[PDB]
Design a protein around this motif. Structure first.
Motif, PDB file in Angstrom:
ATOM      1  N   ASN A   6      36.154  12.068  28.221  1.00  0.00           N
ATOM      2  CA  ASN A   6      35.183  12.593  29.177  1.00  0.00           C
ATOM      3  C   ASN A   6      34.086  11.584  29.483  1.00  0.00           C
ATOM      4  O   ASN A   6      33.668  11.450  30.638  1.00  0.00           O
ATOM      5  CB  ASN A   6      34.574  13.890  28.651  1.00  0.00           C
ATOM      6  N   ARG A   9      35.295   8.897  31.882  1.00  0.00           N
ATOM      7  CA  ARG A   9      35.458   9.438  33.226  1.00  0.00           C
ATOM      8  C   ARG A   9      34.113   9.626  33.910  1.00  0.00           C
ATOM      9  O   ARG A   9      33.958   9.281  35.088  1.00  0.00           O
ATOM     10  CB  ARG A   9      36.220  10.757  33.173  1.00  0.00           C
ATOM     11  N   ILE A  10      33.125  10.151  33.182  1.00  0.00           N
ATOM     12  CA  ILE A  10      31.791  10.333  33.748  1.00  0.00           C
ATOM     13  C   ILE A  10      31.177   8.989  34.119  1.00  0.00           C
ATOM     14  O   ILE A  10      30.580   8.838  35.192  1.00  0.00           O
ATOM     15  CB  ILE A  10      30.897  11.112  32.769  1.00  0.00           C
ATOM     16  N   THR A  13      32.983   7.541  37.205  1.00  0.00           N
ATOM     17  CA  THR A  13      32.614   8.333  38.372  1.00  0.00           C
ATOM     18  C   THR A  13      31.211   7.988  38.845  1.00  0.00           C
ATOM     19  O   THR A  13      30.979   7.832  40.048  1.00  0.00           O
ATOM     20  CB  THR A  13      32.716   9.823  38.054  1.00  0.00           C
ATOM     21  N   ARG A  16      31.245   4.426  40.534  1.00  0.00           N
ATOM     22  CA  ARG A  16      31.872   4.421  41.849  1.00  0.00           C
ATOM     23  C   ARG A  16      31.075   5.234  42.860  1.00  0.00           C
ATOM     24  O   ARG A  16      31.048   4.879  44.040  1.00  0.00           O
ATOM     25  CB  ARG A  16      33.307   4.928  41.756  1.00  0.00           C
ATOM     26  N   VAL A  17      30.409   6.306  42.425  1.00  0.00           N
ATOM     27  CA  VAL A  17      29.554   7.058  43.336  1.00  0.00           C
ATOM     28  C   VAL A  17      28.380   6.205  43.794  1.00  0.00           C
ATOM     29  O   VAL A  17      28.031   6.197  44.981  1.00  0.00           O
ATOM     30  CB  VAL A  17      29.086   8.368  42.676  1.00  0.00           C
ATOM     31  N   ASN A  19      28.256   2.890  43.972  1.00  0.00           N
ATOM     32  CA  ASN A  19      28.760   1.859  44.874  1.00  0.00           C
ATOM     33  C   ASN A  19      29.113   2.436  46.241  1.00  0.00           C
ATOM     34  O   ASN A  19      28.798   1.834  47.277  1.00  0.00           O
ATOM     35  CB  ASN A  19      29.971   1.170  44.252  1.00  0.00           C
ATOM     36  N   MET A  20      29.761   3.602  46.263  1.00  0.00           N
ATOM     37  CA  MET A  20      30.140   4.228  47.523  1.00  0.00           C
ATOM     38  C   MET A  20      28.915   4.625  48.332  1.00  0.00           C
ATOM     39  O   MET A  20      28.902   4.477  49.558  1.00  0.00           O
ATOM     40  CB  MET A  20      31.019   5.447  47.253  1.00  0.00           C
ATOM     41  N   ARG A  23      27.518   1.449  49.915  1.00  0.00           N
ATOM     42  CA  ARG A  23      28.319   1.022  51.059  1.00  0.00           C
ATOM     43  C   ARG A  23      28.119   1.948  52.253  1.00  0.00           C
ATOM     44  O   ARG A  23      28.067   1.487  53.398  1.00  0.00           O
ATOM     45  CB  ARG A  23      29.798   0.947  50.678  1.00  0.00           C
ATOM     46  N   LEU A  24      28.005   3.256  52.009  1.00  0.00           N
ATOM     47  CA  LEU A  24      27.786   4.196  53.103  1.00  0.00           C
ATOM     48  C   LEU A  24      26.414   3.999  53.734  1.00  0.00           C
ATOM     49  O   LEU A  24      26.263   4.134  54.953  1.00  0.00           O
ATOM     50  CB  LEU A  24      27.949   5.630  52.608  1.00  0.00           C
ATOM     51  N   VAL A  27      26.812   1.059  55.986  1.00  0.00           N
ATOM     52  CA  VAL A  27      27.542   1.422  57.199  1.00  0.00           C
ATOM     53  C   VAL A  27      26.643   2.190  58.162  1.00  0.00           C
ATOM     54  O   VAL A  27      26.625   1.915  59.368  1.00  0.00           O
ATOM     55  CB  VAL A  27      28.804   2.228  56.842  1.00  0.00           C
ATOM     56  N   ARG A  30      24.068   0.237  60.154  1.00  0.00           N
ATOM     57  CA  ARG A  30      24.634  -0.709  61.109  1.00  0.00           C
ATOM     58  C   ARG A  30      25.289   0.007  62.288  1.00  0.00           C
ATOM     59  O   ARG A  30      26.390  -0.343  62.716  1.00  0.00           O
ATOM     60  CB  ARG A  30      25.629  -1.632  60.412  1.00  0.00           C
ATOM     61  N   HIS A  32      25.844   0.976  66.196  1.00  0.00           N
ATOM     62  CA  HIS A  32      25.829   0.166  67.406  1.00  0.00           C
ATOM     63  C   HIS A  32      25.608   0.965  68.679  1.00  0.00           C
ATOM     64  O   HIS A  32      25.093   0.412  69.653  1.00  0.00           O
ATOM     65  CB  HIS A  32      27.144  -0.616  67.537  1.00  0.00           C
TER      66      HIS A  32
END
Lengths: 33, 33
Positions: A6, A9-10, A13, A16-17, A19-20, A23-24, A27, A30, A32
């Motif tokens: 566990n 996994r935590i 998670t 990656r949350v 980093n995501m 990135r969002l 995005v 930017r 246009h």
């Protein structure tokens, strides 16, 4: 056995949350149109 | 009862987070401007 615990996994998670979300944010900053 | 435990929810969340992060990275990489 280690990769499916566990805490691992935590941790993955959360990483990656973060980093995501970064990135969002890049995005969305930017657009246009 | 099995579908509503904490471990199963953590596993499903981790899998979908990984998949969504990969897809968002692919979308961000492919830009037309």
């Amino acid at each position: 056995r280690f990769n499916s615990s566990n805490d691992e996994r935590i941790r993955v998670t959360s990483e990656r949350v973060e980093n995501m979300s970064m990135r969002l944010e890049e995005v969305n900053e930017r657009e246009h149109s």
